[PDB]
Design a protein around this ligand. Structure first.
Ligand code: A1CYC
Ligand code: ZN
Ligand code: ZN
Ligand code: ZN
Ligand code: ZN
Lengths: 70, 72
């Protein structure tokens, strides 16, 4: 039904919000510290000197294990 | 259809995986450091001396800003 299409859309959008903002291909699993923006996979987070969201300096990257990880 | 009910269940499970494993009421927005388990809201994470997933001591809690975050 049309309701099935609406639910399919919500699921797709939520899953896309879990992907890296830089490569769009890998799951987010890294946090820029101390700002806390958690928007990248490990490979894209590795070379950023400043946070791509708020421009704060990245002192280090913390790896994150999320229950949503698939 | 039956597929509507199946998608409703997948959406419910995905939304529940984004809620605190301790209170089940607030969104996950905190990471236990250094282990990295990100399973609680800030209120539950502030009350734990050891990680509830791996039992490592919590040196500190890092707040996380996730693109999935929701709010009224
Ligand atoms: C990814 C796996 C295997 O590598 C190291 C240990 N791992 C985890 O801790 C995965 N994990 C279990 C529970 C969670 C949780 F934090 F998301 F709940 N992540
Ligand atoms: Zn990436
Ligand atoms: Zn930032
Ligand atoms: Zn909680
Ligand atoms: Zn842990």
């Amino acid at each position: 039904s049309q309701q099935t299409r609406v639910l399919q859309e919500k699921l797709r959008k939520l899953k896309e919000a879990m992907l890296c903002m830089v490569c769009c291909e890998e799951e987010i699993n890294s946090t820029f510290c101390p700002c806390g923006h958690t928007v990248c996979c490990e490979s894209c987070a590795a070379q950023l000197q400043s946070c791509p969201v708020c421009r704060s300096r990245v002192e280090h990257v913390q790896h994150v294990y999320l229950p949503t990880h698939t």
